[PDB]
Design a protein around this nucleic acid. Structure first.
Lengths: 100, 129, 88, 51, 54
RNA sequence: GCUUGAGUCUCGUAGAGGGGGGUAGAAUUCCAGGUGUAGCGGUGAAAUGCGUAGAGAUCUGGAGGAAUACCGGUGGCGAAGGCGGCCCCCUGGACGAAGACUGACGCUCAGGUGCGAAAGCGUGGGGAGCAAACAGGAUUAGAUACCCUGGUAGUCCACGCCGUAAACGAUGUCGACUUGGAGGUUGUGCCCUUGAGGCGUGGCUUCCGGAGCUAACGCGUUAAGUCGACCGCCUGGGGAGUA
RNA sequence: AAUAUG
């Protein structure tokens, strides 16, 4: 299977809904097949430049093995979700801890 | 591809003489050795020697003169892509007879000097000067 | 490239004893299964001419190999072309 | 970007920006047309830099 | 190695405007510079480090 | 029959390889609105133009299409054309490493077939800049040019067509051999590893050069050296790559 | 700046 290095950035303001979002995301991936080797929810973090004058938004990284389906349904959930801004998914990584 | 290894071997000779290396290595074969025997017979090379089974390597020791190459020139007369025959009543020669050609006759690979006395024509191979 | 599971399957399948990769029968099947798999890739797109070169590279080579097995033996050739299913 | 000098900065003598690249980077896109242009530029500069 | 999440390090290879320091300067070798520049654009994309301020 | 050629498997490397789709910053202009007031713009020198009907200027937002600064290199990759934001999906090839198997399956190829920048054409979209045409103002003996202000087709996209370029290293392709240096670029084994190190070995590639060759200029282990295999093409210039 | 012909 393919290891994916996913990262997304979610609204500062919605941080009380954040743990609810982290549970529903990682459930939908790991229910199918997926297996967490890094999951991190960074907390607030002031931006290097302010994206459309937004500020301090939360960073959320993952490293998961996944089938091609659930990363698609995650990416389309990122295109869906209007409380989430920028998103990336990247190559294998092969399991990591901290360095944030 | 290595279309003719025989003209290659003679070219490795003429390159070897120009670069002034005594030992020249090449893959062995039957007529190559028989040509190397004609070279040693005529006396323009010192000796050949061979090693292999799966991949033979003929190693031919070329002579040198006191202040010169032993070989003046060496050329493939009947080219791979065009085979040329000369009969008993007229056989070619090199440098007014002083040099030799190499000729494959029915009775084998000879020089022109021996082949004219031997009295049969055939395929000329190369001019050793 | 074709799958590792496909390569390790086909060598035991169309081959003889173990390790029979180099022999023509596996080769023809491997190139054909590659060509069939690439048939979907060129089903969509049709602008990728250099990818089509990588297709056409397998096509003539498999075809030339087939001429080799033909000149060696017609019975294995005719039996091979029928089992895979090719050649008008 | 800008000067941001310490407390005794005198009559605005820009220590930082005088060291900076200034109007070189400003000129760099400026110069009229570009699309065909730098094809002959390559290597001829670099070829000069030998001992 | 060449992670974009190396943002503590990648500051050394940017000037005040956020422009990249080239391969002549940095003590790198040609491979690691390509991975570095690639990582910097990824870091730039997420606003972990900046494309440029202004 | 055999294995060094060739082909192929296993494990990797590098990379603007290709298409397809989504998505970003950054920059210009327009559009709408706020503050602010006689110049602005443009030139070697000026005028046409724009501006008190509030411009240019400045500020805030929006709209729209393009192109990817920086890093980027006398770097990379691709048959050639050519390809520089980000990410994914599909997907091409070269090279290394050890090890394995097939066993001449090769090399070249007229006819034939495919690909093939820019311009241009067909149909329907899109059009921020720029820019043939074309207009006007300058220059000039003349200026339908250079110069300057505007500005349409086109430049953009989909799907078709055109098959041409100094499509050039002005080097046909393939293979063997023949002194080198100083580099670049990229894999990998050996070693006291103390090092952004040391001793090696392969592929590609740049500059300088030996014999040699060449009419000279220069080319020169990537040959325009020394040889073989095959294919193309040439026979005064102009008339003509025209009838 | 700008400068034509023998």
């Amino acid at each position: 299977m393919r290891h994916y290095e996913i990262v997304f950035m979610v609204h500062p303001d919605q941080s009380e809904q954040v743990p609810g979002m982290i549970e529903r995301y990682t459930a939908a991936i790991t229910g199918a097949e997926g297996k967490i080797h890094r999951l991190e929810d960074w907390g607030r973090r002031q931006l290097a430049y302010p994206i459309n004058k937004l500020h301090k938004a939360h960073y959320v990284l993952m490293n998961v093995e996944a089938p091609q389906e659930v990363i698609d349904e995650l990416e389309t959930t990122f295109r869906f979700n209007d409380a989430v801004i920028r998103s990336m998914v990247m190559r294998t990584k092969h399991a990591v801890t901290e360095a944030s | 591809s290595m279309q003719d290894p025989i003209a290659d071997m003679l070219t490795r000779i003429r390159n070897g003489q120009a670069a002034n290396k005594a030992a020249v290595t090449m893959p062995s074969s039957k007529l190559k050795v028989a040509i190397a025997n004609v070279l040693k017979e005529e006396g323009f090379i010192e000796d050949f020697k061979v090693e292999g089974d799966t991949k033979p390597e003929l190693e031919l020791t070329l002579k040198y003169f006191q202040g010169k190459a032993v070989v003046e020139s060496i050329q493939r007369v009947s080219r791979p892509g065009l085979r040329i025959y000369k009969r008993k009543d007229e056989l070619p020669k090199v440098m007014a007879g002083l040099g030799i050609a190499v000729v494959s006759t029915s009775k084998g690979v000879m020089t022109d000097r021996a082949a004219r006395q031997a009295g049969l024509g055939g395929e000329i191979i190369c001019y050793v000067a | 490239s074709l799958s590792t599971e496909a390569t390790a399957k086909i060598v035991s399948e169309f081959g003889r004893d173990a390790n029979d990769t180099g022999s023509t029968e596996v080769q023809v099947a491997l190139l054909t299964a590659q060509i069939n798999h690439l048939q979907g890739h060129f089903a969509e797109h049709k602008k990728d001419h250099h990818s089509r070169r990588g297709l056409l590279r397998m096509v003539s080579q498999r075809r030339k190999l087939l001429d080799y097995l033909k000149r060696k033996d017609v019975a294995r050739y005719t039996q091979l072309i029928e089992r895979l299913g090719l050649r008008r | 970007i800008k000067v941001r000098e310490n407390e005794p900065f005198d009559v605005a003598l820009r220590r930082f920006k005088r060291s900076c690249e200034k109007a070189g980077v400003l000129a760099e896109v400026r110069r009229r047309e570009f699309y065909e242009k730098p094809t002959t530029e390559r290597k001829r500069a670099k070829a000069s830099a030998v001992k | 190695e060449i992670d974009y999440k190396d943002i503590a390090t990648l500051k050394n290879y940017i000037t005040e405007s956020g422009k990249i320091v080239p391969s002549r300067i940095t003590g790198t070798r040609a491979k690691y510079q390509r991975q570095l520049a690639r990582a910097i654009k990824r870091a730039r994309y997420l606003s972990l480090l900046p494309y440029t301020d202004r």
